[PDB]
């Protein structure tokens, strides 16, 4: 007695019409069962009549929640009414018995079916998938399922990008990488410009300062009193380098390099300057993000130290689950927490293993417990 079938896809809602009713007497015999697997036989049973794709991602999750609770969405109410005749009562097949009462309330003229005969058809509609759509644009179901899976799954947990903690791990890995490259490129700037004016490389040991001073002092021949004041403004004249660089620049052994050679050092030094500036920026981002994610750990020990501890465990969840002893050795290779000295380290390690928990398993962690946790570490400090 089945005429219409409601199927529901990640790309949309699909309604089917049942041309022929399979032998309900012989449902369990093999030959009718093989027809379900066979596409040629199944196409003779039903044929697609409606497909209404969801408008986009947001609407799909809203329906995915409604269908999970056996509710009729506005989109669902749209496709049925356009299709089911008003009519004694039109018979509809639905996979869910719980959805049945909801459909009946909206449409008094439809009687729902969820018996094994309906389940047999629903299985075969699903078995062929996009083949039954006769080429109607259904996207790709396997991909669409996977997207709604993260979307439908994550919704019930109330996970947040606030809970997300790997940004610290990327920031630390990027930060140390920046430092090595800032240093590595910077030694070159001393070599490239060292040929032209080697004495200056000794005068300004600070590599970041040296790159800036090379940028203005490109040619050591160019030396003016106003230029001396300009380079004097850089850093301070307390070290006296401003007078030394002039005096050294008047009289030096450095062999002049070409204009193209001088074009590279300032540009390549400019590259070093940008990375140092970005490393400063990324460092501040790392500082701010921990206070949001791990206020207790960041307050207890510090931002940079706390992040390095999290990266060692592989995640904030990993850090929390470890026992107190393991956390102590998790930072015992770079001395993060560092006979009486060891007692403070283990004591602080136990507290660090603690504040890691309050950050990880709280939806909006606060710093109230981190502060009272740190003073307890502080008090212990003066006793020993």
């Amino acid at each position: 007695p089945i005429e219409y079938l409601l199927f529901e896809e990640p790309t949309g809602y699909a309604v089917f019409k049942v041309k022929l009713q399979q032998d309900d007497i012989g449902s369990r015999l093999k030959e009718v069962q093989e027809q379900i697997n066979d596409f040629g036989a199944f196409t003779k049973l039903i044929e697609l009549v409606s497909f209404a794709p969801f408008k986009g991602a947001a609407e799909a999750l809203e329906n995915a929640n409604d269908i999970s609770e056996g509710l009729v969405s506005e989109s669902l109410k749209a496709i049925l009414d356009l299709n089911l005749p008003k009519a004694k009562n039109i018979t509809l097949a639905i996979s869910d018995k719980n959805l049945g009462p909801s459909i009946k309330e909206e449409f008094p003229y439809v009687d729902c079916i969820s018996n094994e005969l309906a389940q047999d058809l629903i299985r075969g509609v699903r078995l062929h998938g996009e083949k039954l759509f006769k080429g109607l644009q259904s996207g790709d179901l396997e991909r669409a399922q996977l997207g709604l899976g993260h979307a439908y799954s994550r919704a019930k947990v109330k996970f947040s990008v606030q809970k997300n903690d790997n940004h610290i791990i990327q920031a630390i890995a990027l930060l140390d990488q920046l430092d090595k490259d800032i240093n590595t490129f910077a030694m070159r700037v001393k070599e490239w410009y060292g040929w032209h004016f080697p004495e200056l490389a000794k005068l300004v040991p600070d590599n970041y300062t040296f790159a800036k001073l090379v940028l203005f002092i490109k040619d050591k021949a160019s030396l003016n009193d106003d230029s001396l004041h300009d380079l004097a403004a850089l850093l301070n004249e307390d070290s006296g380098i401003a007078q030394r660089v002039i005096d050294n620049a008047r009289i030096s052994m450095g062999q002049d390099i070409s204009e193209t050679d001088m074009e590279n050092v300032c540009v390549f030094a400019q590259r070093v300057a940008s990375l140092a500036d970005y490393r400063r920026q990324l460092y501040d981002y790392l500082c701010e993000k921990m206070h949001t994610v791990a206020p207790n750990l960041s307050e207890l020990i510090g931002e940079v130290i706390g992040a390095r501890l999290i990266s060692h465990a592989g995640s904030l969840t990993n850090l929390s689950k470890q026992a107190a002893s393991t956390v102590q050795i998790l930072g015992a290779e770079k001395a993060l927490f560092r006979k009486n000295k060891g007692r403070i380290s283990r004591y602080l390690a136990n507290k660090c293993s603690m504040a890691s928990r309050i950050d990880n398993y709280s939806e909006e962690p606060s710093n109230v417990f981190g502060s009272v946790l740190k003073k307890q570490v502080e008090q212990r400090l003066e006793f020993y």
């Binding site: 109410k77 009414d81 356009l82 299709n83 089911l84 005749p85 008003k86």
Partner: peptide
């Protein structure tokens, strides 16, 4: 058979149907 040309709901299912219906009732 269900047809888009003729309404089969017998009541305003959307919020637009009631609004247009009120003017139709109010007009004449």
């Amino acid at each position: 058979h269900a047809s888009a040309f003729t309404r089969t709901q017998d009541v305003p299912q959307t919020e637009l149907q009631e609004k247009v219906d009120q003017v139709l009732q109010e007009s004449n």
